[PDB]
Design a protein around this ligand. Structure first.
Ligand SMILES: COC1CCN(c2nccc(Nc3cc4c(cn3)cc(-c3cn[nH]c3)n4C(C)C)n2)CC1
Length: 299
């Protein structure tokens, strides 16, 4: 098939500054930082993902490969890699963190317009991955990052090709089959995570029971804010027949029609009177002088 002519940018350690730590786990640690290229007079807000074991490097270099091979407004691109002893991925700073925590922390100000717009954006990013013949294998609200409350992007290409049980299609749990239609099942679950304001799917149920639960005909419940219109979409993503499930191009269309009249499809008390931070807010955005967002920094 088509040659992957993507450019892998190697960045010097001296070209960027680590400001603070954002979060640490088993993988390593993600830092908040600034990238100041050559003599460009720009400061790009960045996220730097950083023991050295040859196996862990192959995994991070596999994620770098996939992340450098994407370009879409609703997908996180790799800005570059820094080849130190540790080896670190330089990514775009998504100031508002993951969507999962965002919905939990801001339920009182999240309205129908935002929720439906987020669904359209995830469908667009996912449909792009399908175009690039990329199967995510780990879509969830934790892997959708917030640039601004009005702009979200899909991330975490650590599992992407060409285990998270409660987000998986039945063919995936039973046979390890992953298609773009299995990403649709995970898309259904992600929507459920948003519509419930960050609830844990199948809370209290052990992952081993999930396979048998789905086989019986049981699915995630109808969230209180969901009309039968929105829930019907969730249910269709959870059909046994993968070809029966909607295609992402149909999900973009479905959620877009709904996003034109949000109150008809989602019932939230206090809707329209709610508000989230916007680039039209007082002090929404050290030396703020020459900072440009990665999306406007092109070479
Ligand atoms: C370990 O897996 C990594 C895979 C890549 N992913 C990513 N991808 C693209 C951009 C990006 N930037 C990015 C990631 C961020 C934040 C800002 N910008 C803030 C947080 C955070 C806040 N409180 N706790 C954490 N995080 C998390 C997800 C590490 N982060 C971050 C997680």
């Amino acid at each position: 098939e088509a040659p992957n002519q993507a450019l892998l940018r190697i960045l010097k350690e001296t070209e960027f500054k680590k400001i603070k730590v954002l979060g640490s786990g088993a993988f390593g640690t993600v830092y908040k930082g600034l990238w100041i290229p050559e003599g460009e007079k720009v400061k790009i807000p960045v996220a730097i993902k950083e023991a050295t074991s040859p196996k862990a490097n192959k995994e991070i270099l596999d994620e770098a490969y996939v992340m450098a091979s994407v370009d879409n407004p609703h997908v996180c691109r790799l800005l570059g890699i820094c080849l130190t002893s540790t080896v670190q991925l330089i990514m775009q700073l998504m100031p508002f963190g993951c969507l999962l925590d965002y919905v939990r922390e801001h339920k009182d100000n999240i309205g129908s317009q935002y929720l439906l717009n987020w669904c359209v954006q995830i469908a667009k990013g996912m449909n792009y991955l399908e175009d690039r013949r990329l199967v995510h294998r780990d879509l969830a609200a934790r892997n959708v990052l917030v640039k601004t409350p009005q702009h979200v992007k899909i991330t975490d290409f650590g599992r992407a090709k060409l285990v998270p049980i409660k987000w998986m299609a039945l063919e995936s749990i039973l046979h390890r089959i992953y298609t773009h239609q299995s990403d649709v099942w995970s898309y259904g679950v992600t929507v459920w995570e948003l519509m419930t304001f960050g609830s844990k799917p199948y809370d209290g149920i052990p992952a081993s029971e999930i396979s048998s639960i789905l086989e019986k005909g049981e699915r995630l419940p109808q969230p209180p804010i969901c009309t039968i219109d929105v829930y019907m979409i969730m249910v269709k993503c959870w059909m046994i027949d993968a070809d029966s499930r909607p295609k992402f191009r149909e999900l973009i269309i479905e959620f877009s029609k709904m996003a034109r009249d949000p109150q008809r499809y989602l019932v939230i008390q206090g809707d329209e009177r709610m508000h989230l931070p916007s680039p039209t807010d007082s002090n929404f955005y050290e030396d703020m002088d020459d900072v440009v967002d990665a999306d406007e920094y092109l070479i």
